């Protein structure tokens, strides 16, 4: 996939793990 | 079941003084009925005729003129100065590559107190033995020419109204005084007052207006 959109893929992907981790702080 | 033509009042346009043909053209109004008359309604229109279409000669192909209608009298309406334009084609021709353009302007008053803004354009010429294919001034050159142009333009106005200013613009006296003071600085070709607009007329004064007529 376009590198630009793979970067976006994982931008989001991190935002969710950033989110799910917070539930547990 | 109308056709406003089988109704429209008709009219011819007369020009001011310091040119050639005072007769100019025709127009349509509406019959001066009680409530909404042909008179006070419009008249105040304006007309654009090339002055070569109004001076006869062709050493004036460009240079357009705005005439505004101020007064009316029995199928005869005069007109006065309202501006001066250039033709689109002439400029587009004057403005060629490989050379520097120069423009400058000023707002200023006249005797009979019409205020106006006159324009001025000039391009750098190669001079007849040059080798380099372009010819550019030196910015420091450009700033000089403008200031002098401006010095000259302000002087030429507030002579006896647009009246004398019109009488001044027609034979392009301005053009060559520019040409004069300038050649101490840089070459230059074309050089014209290009434009001039009106923005602050005084008061009607039915007297003074009537001085161009006879």
């Amino acid at each position: 996939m376009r590198a630009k959109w793979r970067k976006k893929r994982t931008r989001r992907l991190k935002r969710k793990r950033r989110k799910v981790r917070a539930r547990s702080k | 079941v109308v056709d406003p033509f089988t109704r429209k009042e008709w009219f011819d346009i007369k020009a001011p003084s310091t040119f050639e043909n005072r007769n100019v053209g025709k127009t349509l109004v509406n019959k001066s009925t009680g409530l909404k008359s042909a008179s006070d309604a419009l008249k105040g229109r304006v007309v654009e005729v090339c002055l070569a279409d109004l001076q006869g000669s062709e050493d004036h192909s460009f240079r357009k003129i705005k005439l505004r209608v101020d007064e009316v009298q029995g199928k005869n309406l005069l007109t006065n100065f309202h501006g001066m334009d250039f033709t689109t084609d002439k400029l587009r021709s004057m403005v060629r590559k490989w050379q520097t353009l120069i423009e400058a302007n000023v707002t200023v008053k006249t005797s009979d107190d019409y205020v106006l803004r006159i324009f001025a354009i000039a391009f750098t010429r190669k001079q007849a033995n040059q080798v380099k294919r372009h010819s550019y001034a030196q910015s420091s050159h450009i700033r000089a020419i403008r200031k002098v142009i401006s010095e000259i333009l302000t002087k030429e106005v507030q002579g006896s109204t647009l009246a004398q200013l019109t009488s001044k613009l027609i034979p392009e006296v301005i053009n060559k005084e520019i040409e004069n003071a300038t050649k101490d600085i840089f070459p230059l070709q074309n050089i014209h007052v290009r434009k001039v607009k009106l923005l602050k007329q005084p008061k009607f004064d039915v007297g003074a207006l009537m001085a161009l007529h006879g």
Partner: protein, 127 residues
């Protein structure tokens, strides 16, 4: 010699405007466009139409009072194509060849000291 008025032929694509008015402009005299004298949208600017409309416009122009007329041909302008449309030349041709005089004509296509962002976005109208 004649009686004079203004022609002003706006010629964009998809339509061509012809309408003569008083040399002051304030007062019209007969119009009609290219979209009038044929019906197909697609052909709304074609030279064949603007002819037939330059024909119907010449007619009235002389059937009212104007014996002659100067022209001011014009394109879309502004932040648009700025180039002459198709049925401008056909219009001019049709109104001189009609039975009307011609005198000193210039271009009046609005040209900006550029700006107001063009339409269709940075990547262009793409198809």
């Amino acid at each position: 010699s004649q009686v004079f008025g203004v022609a002003r032929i706006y010629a964009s694509f998809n339509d061509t405007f012809v309408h003569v008015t008083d040399l002051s402009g304030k007062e019209t005299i007969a119009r009609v466009t290219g979209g009038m004298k044929v019906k197909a949208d697609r052909d709304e600017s074609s030279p064949y139409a603007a002819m037939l409309a330059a024909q119907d416009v010449a007619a009235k122009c002389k059937e009212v009072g104007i014996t002659a007329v100067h022209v001011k041909i014009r394109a879309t302008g502004g932040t648009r194509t700025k180039t002459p449309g198709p049925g401008g030349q056909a219009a001019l041709r049709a109104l001189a060849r009609s039975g009307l005089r011609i005198g000193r004509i210039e271009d009046v296509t609005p040209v900006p000291s550029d700006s107001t962002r063009k339409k269709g976005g940075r990547r262009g109208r793409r198809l």
